Amino acid sequence: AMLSFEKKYRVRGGTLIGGDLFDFWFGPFYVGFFGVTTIFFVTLGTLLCVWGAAMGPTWNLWQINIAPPDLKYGLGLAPLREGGLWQIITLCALGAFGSWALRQAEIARKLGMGMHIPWAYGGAILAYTTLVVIRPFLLGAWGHGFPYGIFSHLDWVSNVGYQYLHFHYNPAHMIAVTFFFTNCLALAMHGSLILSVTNPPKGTPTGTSEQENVFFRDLLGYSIGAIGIHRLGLFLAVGAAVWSAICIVISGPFWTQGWPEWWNWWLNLPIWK
Amino acid sequence: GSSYQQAPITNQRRMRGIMIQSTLWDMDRKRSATRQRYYPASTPANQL
Amino acid sequence: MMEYIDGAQIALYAFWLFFFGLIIYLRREDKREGYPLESPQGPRDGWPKGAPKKTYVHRDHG
Amino acid sequence: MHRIWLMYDPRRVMVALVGFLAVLALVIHFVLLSSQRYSWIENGTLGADQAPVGASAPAAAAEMSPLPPGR
Amino acid sequence: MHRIWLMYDPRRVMVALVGFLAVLALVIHFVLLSSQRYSWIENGTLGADQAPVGASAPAA
Amino acid sequence: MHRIWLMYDPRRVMVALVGFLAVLALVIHFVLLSSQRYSWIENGTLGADQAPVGASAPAA
Amino acid sequence: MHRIWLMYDPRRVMVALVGFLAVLALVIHFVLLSSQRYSWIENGTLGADQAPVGASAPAA
Amino acid sequence: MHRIWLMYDPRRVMVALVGFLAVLALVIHFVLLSSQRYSWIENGTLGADQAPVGASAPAA
Amino acid sequence: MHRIWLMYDPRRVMVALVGFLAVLALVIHFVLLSSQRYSWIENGTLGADQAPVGASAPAAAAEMSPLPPGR
Amino acid sequence: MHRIWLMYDPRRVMVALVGFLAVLALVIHFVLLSSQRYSWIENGTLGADQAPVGASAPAA
Amino acid sequence: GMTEEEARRFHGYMVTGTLGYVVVASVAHFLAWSWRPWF
Amino acid sequence: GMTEEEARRFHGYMVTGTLGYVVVASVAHFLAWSWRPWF
Amino acid sequence: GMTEEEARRFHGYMVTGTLGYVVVASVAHFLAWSWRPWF
Amino acid sequence: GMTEEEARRFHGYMVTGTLGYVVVASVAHFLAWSWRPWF
Amino acid sequence: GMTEEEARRFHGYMVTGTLGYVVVASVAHFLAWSWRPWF
Amino acid sequence: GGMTEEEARRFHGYMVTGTLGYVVVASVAHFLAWSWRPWF
Amino acid sequence: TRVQVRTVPEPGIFSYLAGKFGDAQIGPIYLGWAGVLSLIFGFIAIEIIGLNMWASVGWDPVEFIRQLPWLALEPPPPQYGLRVPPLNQGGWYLMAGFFLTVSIILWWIRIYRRARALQMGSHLPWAFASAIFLYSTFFFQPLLVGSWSEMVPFGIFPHLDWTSAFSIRYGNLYYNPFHALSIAFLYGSAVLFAMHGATILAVARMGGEREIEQITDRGTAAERSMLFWRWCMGFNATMESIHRWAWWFAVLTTFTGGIGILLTGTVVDNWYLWGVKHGLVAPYPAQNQLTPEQQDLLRGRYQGTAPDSFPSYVV
Ligand SMILES: CCCCCCCCCCCCCC(=O)OC[C@H](COP(=O)(O)OCC(O)COP(=O)(O)OC[C@@H](COC(=O)CCCCCCCCCCCCC)OC(=O)CCCCCCCCCCCCC)OC(=O)CCCCCCCCCCCCC
Ligand SMILES: CCCCCCCCCCCCCC(=O)OC[C@H](COP(=O)(O)OCC(O)COP(=O)(O)OC[C@@H](COC(=O)CCCCCCCCCCCCC)OC(=O)CCCCCCCCCCCCC)OC(=O)CCCCCCCCCCCCC
Ligand code: BCL
Ligand code: BCL
Ligand SMILES: CC[C@H]1c2cc3[nH]c4c(c3C)C(=O)[C@H](C(=O)OC)c4c3nc(cc4[nH]c(cc(n2)[C@@H]1C)c(C(C)=O)c4C)[C@@H](C)[C@@H]3CCC(=O)OC/C=C(\C)CCC[C@H](C)CCC[C@H](C)CCCC(C)C
Ligand SMILES: COC(C)(C)C/C=C/C(C)=C/C=C/C(C=O)=C/C=C/C(C)=C/C=C/C=C(C)/C=C/C=C(\C)CC/C=C(C)/C=C/C=C(\C)C(=O)O
Ligand SMILES: COC(C)(C)C/C=C/C(C)=C/C=C/C(C=O)=C/C=C/C(C)=C/C=C/C=C(C)/C=C/C=C(\C)CC/C=C(C)/C=C/C=C(\C)C(=O)O
Ligand SMILES: COC(C)(C)C/C=C/C(C)=C/C=C/C(C)=C/C=C/C(C)=C/C=C\C=C(C)\C=C\C=C(C)\C=C\C=C(C)\C=C\CC(C)(C)OC
Ligand SMILES: CCCCCCCCCCCCO[C@@H]1O[C@H](CO)[C@@H](O[C@H]2O[C@H](CO)[C@@H](O)[C@H](O)[C@H]2O)[C@H](O)[C@H]1O
Ligand SMILES: CCCCCCCCCCCCO[C@@H]1O[C@H](CO)[C@@H](O[C@H]2O[C@H](CO)[C@@H](O)[C@H](O)[C@H]2O)[C@H](O)[C@H]1O
Numbered sequence A: 001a002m003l004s005f006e007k008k009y010r011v012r013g014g015t016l017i018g019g020d021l022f023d024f025w026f027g028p029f030y031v032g033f034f035g036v037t038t039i040f041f042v043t044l045g046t047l048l049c050v051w052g053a054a055m056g057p058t059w060n061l062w063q064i065n066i067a068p069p070d071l072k073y074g075l076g077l078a079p080l081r082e083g084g085l086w087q088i089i090t091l092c093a094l095g096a097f098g099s100w101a102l103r104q105a106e107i108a109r110k111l112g113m114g115m116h117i118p119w120a121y122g123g124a125i126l127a128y129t130t131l132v133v134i135r136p137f138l139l140g141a142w143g144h145g146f147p148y149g150i151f152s153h154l155d156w157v158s159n160v161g162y163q164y165l166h167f168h169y170n171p172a173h174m175i176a177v178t179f180f181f182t183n184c185l186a187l188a189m190h191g192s193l194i195l196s197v198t199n200p201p202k203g204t205p206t207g208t209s210e211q212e213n214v215f216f217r218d219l220l221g222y223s224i225g226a227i228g229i230h231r232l233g234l235f236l237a238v239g240a241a242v243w244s245a246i247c248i249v250i251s252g253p254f255w256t257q258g259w260p261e262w263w264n265w266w267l268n269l270p271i272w273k
Numbered sequence B: 001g002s003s004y005q006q007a008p009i010t011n012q013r014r015m016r017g018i019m020i021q022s023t024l025w026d027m028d029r030k031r032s033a034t035r036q037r038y039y040p041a042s043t044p045a046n047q048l
Numbered sequence C: 001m002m003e004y005i006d007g008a009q010i011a012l013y014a015f016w017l018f019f020f021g022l023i024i025y026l027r028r029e030d031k032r033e034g035y036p037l038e039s040p041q042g043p044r045d046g047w048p049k050g051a052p053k054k055t056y057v058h059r060d061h062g
Numbered sequence D, I: 001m002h003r004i005w006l007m008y009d010p011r012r013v014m015v016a017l018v019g020f021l022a023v024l025a026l027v028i029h030f031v032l033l034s035s036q037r038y039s040w041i042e043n044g045t046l047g048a049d050q051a052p053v054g055a056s057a058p059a060a061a062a063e064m065s066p067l068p069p070g071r
Numbered sequence E, F, G, H, J: 001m002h003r004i005w006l007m008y009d010p011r012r013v014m015v016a017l018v019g020f021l022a023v024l025a026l027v028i029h030f031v032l033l034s035s036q037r038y039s040w041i042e043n044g045t046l047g048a049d050q051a052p053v054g055a056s057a058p059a060a
Numbered sequence K, L, M, N, O: 001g002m003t004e005e006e007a008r009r010f011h012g013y014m015v016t017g018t019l020g021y022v023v024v025a026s027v028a029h030f031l032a033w034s035w036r037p038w039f
Numbered sequence P: 001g002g003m004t005e006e007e008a009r010r011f012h013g014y015m016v017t018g019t020l021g022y023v024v025v026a027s028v029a030h031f032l033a034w035s036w037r038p039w040f
Numbered sequence Q: 001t002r003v004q005v006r007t008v009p010e011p012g013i014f015s016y017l018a019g020k021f022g023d024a025q026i027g028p029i030y031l032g033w034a035g036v037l038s039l040i041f042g043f044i045a046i047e048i049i050g051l052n053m054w055a056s057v058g059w060d061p062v063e064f065i066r067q068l069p070w071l072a073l074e075p076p077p078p079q080y081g082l083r084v085p086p087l088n089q090g091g092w093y094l095m096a097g098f099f100l101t102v103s104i105i106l107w108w109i110r111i112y113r114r115a116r117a118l119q120m121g122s123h124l125p126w127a128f129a130s131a132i133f134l135y136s137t138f139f140f141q142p143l144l145v146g147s148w149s150e151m152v153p154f155g156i157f158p159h160l161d162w163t164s165a166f167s168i169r170y171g172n173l174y175y176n177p178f179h180a181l182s183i184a185f186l187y188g189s190a191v192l193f194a195m196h197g198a199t200i201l202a203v204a205r206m207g208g209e210r211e212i213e214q215i216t217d218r219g220t221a222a223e224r225s226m227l228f229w230r231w232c233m234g235f236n237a238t239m240e241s242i243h244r245w246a247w248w249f250a251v252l253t254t255f256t257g258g259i260g261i262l263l264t265g266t267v268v269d270n271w272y273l274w275g276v277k278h279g280l281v282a283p284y285p286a287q288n289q290l291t292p293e294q295q296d297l298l299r300g301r302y303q304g305t306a307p308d309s310f311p312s313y314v315v
């Protein structure tokens, strides 16, 4: 099925690899060559996850836990039951996530859009790749990756934080949190302003750009403009993920003490040492 | 404890934050800042 | 008294019922443009059925 | 002196004045209510020679304890 | 004094006044309820001589 | 007194009043249900002189 | 000397002055109230001969 | 030297100067107030021969 | 050398210069104030011979076995 | 060699030069002030033989 | 808006409702007082 | 806005309603003071 | 804004209200002093 | 902005109000010093 | 926009106010010195 | 616009004199500081 | 870029209009009576916090800047419960908390009045009300457990110390399901604003950033936005309704958060054990095993009062 205006847009072209061979739709979904590779990696990775659940102690959704290997295996592929299965799923995940970004680029090219969405999603892939590839590689063992399990990965996050005694003191973590919190405020603010001009109180004319500009200026003391708020939202949301990637990659590869004692440099500035 | 006995004022911390001894004072050993950690002595004028 | 039932579990299922109710509401709003769908077998509404097209009135300067 | 109301809009001044008097009165009442000598809700019935004097020590109470018994 | 209602719309003042009095009453009731002497829900049936009193002057 | 209904829309006043009374009634019932003396769901059948009373003055 | 008020708007200078003095008065009262010698709400009735002094007692 | 006021608007200069002087004076007073020797609110009555002095050389 | 003031605005260089000198003067005073030898607000009344001096090389084996402080 | 000032504007370079020298000078002074050997504010009056020296090789 | 005749009409019901509510509350309080006095 | 005679009329209700409310609060304090005086 | 004679009128009430408020505050302080002096 | 005589009138009030406030503060310090000298 | 006449006039006050400020600060320093010398 | 060369000479003459006068009082400040507590 | 226009007379019919949109004054940043009072009350709250922080380093202005992120205005001691505490032991804390709370509520009123004056829907004050709800649970949960000592200290690192210790005291907040939901909406808010910001910038060439026009008179920029997401993930919003998804994901972050805090210490005291009860906790092989004598030997005591004496041990 198609949107009432859609058929007009379903032209050939804008693909990156496959030419016309995969340049077709399946229901709403565009396929393309990276659609094919997406579904391959999605299916393989999901069935290996289900296999990891089957050989694990329970089928309870919350408790399933496909763990990485022991650190003794270093950068080798461990035995599959000992964590090598986690390593195969991680390759499938990278294949799926990369294929998804490239498929989005084909869709944007076909519609004459800018590449902003693929590159924005690249910020999330960067953070994932930092957690399971880059930081484990710098530490020298794939066993530093997080386990695949809805709550067991929260046990990993907990224990990684306390490896540095008081992870709130991580300076890049403070920035990343500030981006996440500022993003959520900005989303509430922008969402509310658009809705409140397009849905005024009953018996009132539909609002205008000028009204949301006036109100926004009362809120922040400056007018951001229509493109500016979308630049801001993209900057905040993606900047949050980039600072998240930084905050975890410095923990271990570069800093190994408690995070509180990192602040010793500030106490020792020569103006007040 | 059954009842509370106040410490001498020179043993009372100016900073009431509970973790300060681990988060700051383990690493900070500047002399002036170390002096500010407790209240100074205080005596009724007639006892001097 | 009830051992397994507790207030945090009660509150959570109350949230789930609200939340699925909200997803249904949002998907109705998502269908105010572009629907009903065209198809070879005729028009299609999907689910939930969309809210109607919405007409806007603009401030009269006359 | 009346020309002050020609320099400042009295409609603006009165809101600031009421606000200033409100915060000032509330600060002073909370200060006294937290004092030993003037915590009048608990101790207002004490006579003047029975009321605390000189209780200026910064840690008059234990800082660290369990919560009071729940029931 | 009635000309104050030419500076301030009494429609607006009356709502602000009612809101201020509601908050003030709630604060005063809550301050008393969380006291020892006036925790009237648990202890309101005590006679005036049975009600709690704060500590006298220490170190007499 | 009736002219207050010309100053304010009765639709908004009644919504405001119902909202206020609903919140206030719910608060007071929860304050009592949390208390010891008035936790009526568990202890409502106790006689008045067997219901909890808060601490009196430290006479000893 | 009055031409200072041709150079600056007195409507702003007075607000700045009043705000500065209000904050300064608050700071000084807070500093004194935080001291031992001038903790006047607790100890204001002490005579100056027995008010606190920031010195250690002789010979302990 | 008065031609300097042709090069700089005294409206700008005096606001900057008054701001600088006020901040500097406050910093100096608080640096003194937090020292041992000049904590005058607690110890201002002492008299110079018995005010504190920072420790002489460890080699003593 | 005066032609430097054709090259740069003589109005703006003065603001840059005074700003620099003020920051440098403050920095040097606060560096000194935090030191031990020049903590002049506490120890300014000491004579130069009795002012503090930083630690010195032992000028010896740095090895001679200790003796206890006399009881 | 003065033809180099037909390529590069003196206005741009002399600012960049002063900036670089000021930063470099300040970095070196603080590096030295943080060392044991050259902590001259505390130890500047020590003779050269008295000043600290880093640890030698034991070779044994 | 509203007419002053409508306001006079509405006020009569609003006062009667308020009185009825206060009466029901007064019985509720006296029942509660009889069961477990708070003074 | 308001005419002066309309402001004049409102002011009468406003003063009387204020003083009435202060009278009721005065009686509530008489009752509270009798039950458990605070000085 | 406001005319001068209109400012004169308003000022008279501000003076009167301030004086009345300071009077009530003075009685409040002398009651408080007689109950529990702070010097 | 202001005329020169209008500034001259304001300056009269501004100076006299400043010196009045300094006089009140002077007596406040006289009373504080009599109660508890700080030197 | 200063004229040279206004600049001359203003400078006389600026010098005078600076001298008054320095004089008061000089008395304040000598009071402080005679109470508690810092060298 | 810019600076005329006779103004630049006037400005330079002040600027150099002011700079040197500042250095002179700083010289006396170091003379006093050194005689109170020398740093070498 | 780098061909900016500059408008000398007033835009809105750089510079800004002085005028009216009906009841709404244009020009100055709007305060009104509620905004002015909010700033007065909030200023006093900020002053009380800062003066207490500065007093805690003995008024030393160098230490005030040097130690600033470690400084705290700290809640009352636990044994006071809900009673008024001494001024130096949390009395200033409760006073600053009161004025801050009033200031926040007056700011909400200021925003609510301004939305109505501009003839706008009420969406923004109800979004702000969700944030205020979470804030208020840092009062109501200490109230429900019965002690102001449980409140959040005012201070940069100190309030993060509290945040960690709260999770420790209540047995790991990761297993609180409303905390888990609140995180899902926090992450979802970043997902949505990344997706939406990138979408509108990707069609900005076609006038897609003029969202109100695209809502009232659907252009090709809206159609391409809808088709991108439909072709990518199989379903799409509209130019209006994407702002409803945005609004609800932001609002549900603090709303579900507040419920999670109110439940903690009142209904559940150990969230990990609640997780075990309800089947959330993944099993791991045992790292140690206690003998029955060790189960008695290794139980501790609950933490008590600090020692109020300096014992001599004269022996
Ligand atoms: C429902 C009654 C009870 C209600 C109470 C409980 C549920 C409440 C939610 C109800 C939501 C609506 C469900 C529904 O029927 O939708 C039909 C519609 C399809 O589009 P349409 O416009 O409506 O219809 C057109 C179509 O009918 C005709 O066109 P065509 O013939 O070309 O279409 C092919 C069809 C075939 O239809 C299907 O296959 C339906 C598939 C539904 C899958 C739902 C799975 C949910 C469980 C997953 C468990 C996990 C499995 C791994 O259409 C399609 O091709 C499907 C396009 C949608 C693809 C959805 C992809 C996944 C969406 C997210 C999944 C959840 C992630 C947490 O599909 C959608 O819109 C689905 C996505 C919308 C919801 C996204 C919500 C995400 C919330 C994330 C926050 C979570 C925080 C905790
Ligand atoms: C546990 C929570 C902790 C937390 C507890 C605290 C939470 C408090 C939250 C309160 C939020 C209310 C928001 C609001 O009302 O905004 C609009 C309005 C201004 O509106 P405008 O558009 O700018 O101006 C026009 C205005 O007149 C509104 O006109 P509208 O067309 O909407 O029509 C009427 C009102 C409804 O009005 C009334 O009901 C007034 C009835 C007056 C009757 C007078 C007596 C007559 C004799 C009796 C006859 C016999 C029959 C009765 O429109 C509305 O629907 C808005 C709400 C009105 C109610 C205001 C709130 C009062 C209740 C507060 C409850 C507190 C909590 C229980 O704002 C205001 O006027 C100010 C609101 C009150 C703020 C008080 C100041 C804040 C506290 C400061 C504390 C200082 C230290 C102690
Ligand atoms: C426009 C005037 C000229 C000038 C003209 C003279 C003249 C003429 C003489 C000096 C002399 C001296 N000048 Mg010169 N001098 C100027 C600027 C300076 C500056 C500076 C920071 O710019 C400094 C540090 C000095 C310093 C000095 C001394 C080294 C020296 C001895 C007198 C003294 O103690 O003066 C103390 C004063 C200061 C440190 C600062 C103020 C300088 C004033 C404006 C100079 C004029 C007053 C003059 C000294 C009065 C006595 C001599 C008269 C001919 C009667 N001058 C300016 C640029 N100077 C004398 C000398 O060399 O004697 C052997 C001398 O005869
Ligand atoms: C060891 C630490 C604990 C932990 C302890 C807590 C605690 C404790 C809390 C949270 C809460 C939250 N945590 Mg958690 N949290 C941990 C791990 C995580 C991780 C992670 C990757 O590990 C993440 C992503 C999160 C994420 C989150 C958020 C979803 C949630 C806050 C929502 C919000 O917007 O708050 C930010 C928004 C606000 C605080 C609202 C503020 C609104 C007011 C009105 C603003 C007023 C401003 C004022 C006027 C300005 C002047 C102020 C003066 C200067 C003083 N937590 C671990 C398990 N977390 C909160 C929650 O909801 O829990 C259920 C909470 O209370
Ligand atoms: C949906 C959930 C998210 C959310 C939403 C949200 N927050 C909001 C809003 C919304 C929708 C607003 O509309 C509101 C706002 O105004 O935004 C600009 C607000 C707001 N969110 C804020 C903060 C905030 N939000 C946070 C979080 C969140 N906000 C969530 C993530 C956080 C975090 C993560 O901790 C913070 C810190 C504020 C910026 C703002 C509310 C401002 C407010 O209430 O201010 C009260 C007043 C003061 C603090 C006093 C200031 C005092 C001055 C500095 C003194 C200057 C002197 C003065 C002039 C003296 C007086 C003289 C008088 C005569 C004037
Ligand atoms: C830590 O230290 C701590 C412990 C805190 C200690 C330190 C405390 C400190 C620093 C205190 C400072 C106090 C202070 C200053 O600074 C205090 C200054 C107080 C002042 C100035 C009070 C003034 C009050 C004035 C009032 C009430 C006026 C009321 C007027 C009324 C009623 C009439 C209104 C007009 C009408 C009706 C006419 C309309 C006619 C119209 C329209 C017409 O006619 O047209
Ligand atoms: C750790 O170190 C630590 C401990 C911190 C150590 C410290 C170290 C340091 C680095 C200290 C630095 C100090 C310093 C500089 O550097 C200090 C510099 C101070 C200065 C410059 C003070 C100057 C004051 C001048 C004043 C008050 C002038 C007032 C003028 C008035 C009133 C008149 C106004 C005009 C009128 C009336 C006429 C209008 C007519 C008009 C308009 C017309 O006619 O048109
Ligand atoms: C001279 O001026 C100076 C220089 C001092 C000004 C400078 C000030 C500075 C530098 C201030 C710095 C402030 C900082 C850094 C503040 C940091 C604050 C942070 C990070 C706070 C974080 C969280 C705080 C929370 C959640 C607090 C919540 C408190 C609440 C909800 C309290 C509510 C209290 C209520 C409602 C009522 C109390 C009174 C009752 C009713 C109980 O009666 C007694
Ligand atoms: C418009 C103004 C409205 C408010 C006016 C208030 C005016 C108050 C004036 C206070 C005058 C105090 O008057 C009197 O001062 C003397 C010293 O002079 C004090 O004297 C006593 O205390 C001081 C200080 O502890 C001792 O040093 C002294 O030896 C002792 O006699 C008295 O205790 C006081 O009664
Ligand atoms: C606010 C009134 C409601 C009762 C409040 C509690 C007080 C109880 C005593 C009420 C006694 C009667 O109170 C009195 O009522 C009359 C009308 O009847 C009001 O009268 C007011 O309106 C009338 C017109 O309607 C004007 O002509 C008059 O000048 C004005 O004062 C008075 O302002 C009030 O003082």
Ligand SMILES: CCCCCCCCCCCCO[C@@H]1O[C@H](CO)[C@@H](O[C@H]2O[C@H](CO)[C@@H](O)[C@H](O)[C@H]2O)[C@H](O)[C@H]1O
Pocket: N008, N009, N011, N012, N013, N016, N017, N020, N021, N023, N024
């Ligand atoms: C509590 C007592 C101590 C504090 C006293 C505070 C109030 C000041 C006391 C003196 C009062 C008289 O003070 C004097 O008032 C007159 C107006 O009357 C001011 O006069 C000012 O305005 C008038 C016009 O009204 C101008 O013509 C005049 O040139 C100008 O100076 C004077 O500048 C001021 O010096």
Ligand SMILES: CCCCCCCCCCCCO[C@@H]1O[C@H](CO)[C@@H](O[C@H]2O[C@H](CO)[C@@H](O)[C@H](O)[C@H]2O)[C@H](O)[C@H]1O
Pocket: P009, P010, P011, P012, P013, P014, P015, P017, P021, P024, P025
């Ligand atoms: C607080 C200070 C205490 C320490 C002492 C400081 C001493 C300062 C020395 C100031 C000497 C001024 O001496 C001299 O003044 C004249 C004007 O009078 C300036 O003269 C300047 O302007 C004139 C025009 O008027 C130009 O022709 C000349 O080329 C130019 O230099 C000089 O640049 C300065 O050298």
Ligand SMILES: [Fe+3]
Pocket: A190, A194, Q196, Q200, Q211, Q243
């Ligand atoms: Fe948008």
